Amino acid sequence: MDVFLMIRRHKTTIFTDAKESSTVFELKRIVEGILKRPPDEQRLYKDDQLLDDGKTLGECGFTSQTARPQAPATVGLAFRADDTFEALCIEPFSSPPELPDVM
C-alpha cells in the first residue's frame, strides 16, 4: 500500500509516495535522486525520532490510512555538512490571515 509523504528540511518540502513495506534507507535513495545527497549524509525523522535505515515505513507509523494523498505525513530531513549533522530544522509554513468578518 502506498503512503503519501512530505519530506521536509528548512524551506524544502518533497511530495512523494512510497510503499508501506519500503525502508527508511530506501526513502533516502529517493531523496538522493531528488536533492543529490547520498543516504549517509541524510537523517530522517518522525517528529524528533531519528529513523533507523532498516525499518519499514509502516513500522515507523507511516501507514496508508494516515499518510493520505490529501493529508500526507511529514518526514523530517537533516543533512551532514562535512563532518557533523545539522540539527533537524523545518521552517513552518506561513500563517493564514484572520477570517474576514463575513466568514
34 contacts other proteins (rule: CB under 8 A): yes
65 contacts other proteins (rule: CB under 8 A): no
| Contact predicate 27/45, CB 8 Å | no
Region from 15-23, 40-48, 50-58, 75-83 binding other proteins, contact rule CB under 8 A:
15-23
Q: Report, in Å, the least distance between residue 78 CB and other proteins.
A: 16
d(CA 75, CA 45): 6
- When the beta carbons of 84 and 94 are compared against other proteins, the nearer one is 94
29 contacts other proteins (rule: CB under 8 A): no
Q: Report, in Å, the least distance between residue 3 CB and other proteins.
A: 11
- Write the CB contacts of 30 (distance below 8 Å, at least 6 apart in sequence): 16, 18
